């Protein structure tokens, strides 16, 4: 009894409005989105096996109109296949509209639209950084807990045509086999240490060789050599991750063996960064589409 197209229509309706309008769905509609997307998440692998062509996006953090711009320029589903790398909520003004549109497209196009878990798709984090406050203000506490149950079933990583490894954070010193990811059962929370934690929290670092301590106080940093060894062992060409704001929306690491994507331009009004999307064609030739305010 989920009127998906009505929901999507109302979400897209506010395109090009100024001042930026909210989209206030009903409580039951949002719960319907959570319940149906949760089922699909669980029915699909926790380690996604995807095929190009597709477009890959980094953090959104509730910057809803920027998400609309991404679709406007990259092509609204199902014109293009999409993989998002997480951190949909918190900090921005419109986490609800953001995650609702994403869940809606997941339900609408379950084989052409994919969402990974970021470290903010976690109750202990998004209780603090804005999403819970937004849920409490615009709906109720119970709805936030419904989101949490949904978030606990998000897939953790994706491999594109057996060559591009995708996750929110990065590598883990505990990651020896891809089966270790496949063995993770859902629903699950994000632990404060271990494989699942690292995949959502770790960062590359140009000044560390192997594994180092992360300034975040969580997980690790990893160096160029770690990336090289990982790619060789698993016969991969590229690591695609997000989790860090970069000035041009994308940023290479270790001679293009790793790329960081960040899709929220002028991040929470504090940075002058561009947002980027990585376009991967059928042959895995990768390029970038860059979202930037005019000056």
């Amino acid at each position: 009894s989920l009127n998906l197209d009505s929901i999507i229509g109302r979400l897209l309706e506010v395109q090009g409005s100024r001042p930026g309008k909210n989209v206030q769905l009903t409580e039951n509609e949002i719960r319907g989105l959570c319940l149906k997307s949760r089922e699909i998440f669980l029915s699909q692998p926790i380690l996604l096996e995807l095929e190009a062509p597709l477009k890959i996006c980094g953090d959104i953090h509730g910057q809803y109109y920027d998400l609309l711009r991404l679709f406007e320029y990259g092509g609204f589903p199902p014109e293009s296949n999409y993989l998002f790398l997480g951190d949909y909520v918190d900090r921005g003004k419109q986490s609800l509209e953001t995650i609702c549109l994403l869940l809606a497209y997941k339900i609408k196009y379950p084989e052409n639209f994919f969402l990974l878990r970021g470290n903010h798709e976690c109750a202990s984090i998004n209780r603090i950084y804005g999403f819970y406050d937004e849920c409490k203000r615009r709906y109720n506490i119970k709805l936030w807990k419904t989101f949490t149950d949904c978030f606990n079933c998000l897939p953790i990583a994706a491999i594109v045509d057996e060559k591009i490894f995708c996750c929110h954070g990065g590598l883990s010193p505990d990651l020896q086999s891809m089966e270790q990811i496949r063995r993770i059962m859902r629903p699950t929370d994000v632990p404060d240490q271990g494989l699942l934690c690292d995949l959502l929290w770790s960062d590359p670092d140009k000044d560390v060789q192997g594994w180092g301590e992360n300034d975040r106080g969580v997980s690790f940093t990893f160096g160029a050599e770690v990336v090289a060894k990982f790619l060789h062992k698993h016969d991969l060409d590229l690591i695609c991750r997000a989790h860090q704001v970069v000035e041009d929306g994308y940023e290479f690491f270790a001679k293009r063996q790793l790329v960081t994507l960040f899709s929220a331009p002028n991040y929470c009004g504090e940075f002058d960064n561009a947002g980027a999307m990585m376009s991967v064609d059928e042959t895995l030739m990768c390029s970038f589409q860059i979202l930037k305010p005019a000056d």
Binding site: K163, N266, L291, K292, P293
Partner: peptide, 30 residues
């Protein structure tokens, strides 16, 4: 079997520019 490649540097980036609203983006924690 596919392999990751990159285009010529001139075709690596495609830019999309939009009008900046200075009130559109806020950190709700501040």
């Amino acid at each position: 079997r596919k392999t990751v490649t990159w285009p010529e540097e001139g075709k690596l980036r495609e830019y999309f520019y939009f009008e900046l609203d200075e009130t559109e983006r806020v950190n709700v924690n501040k």
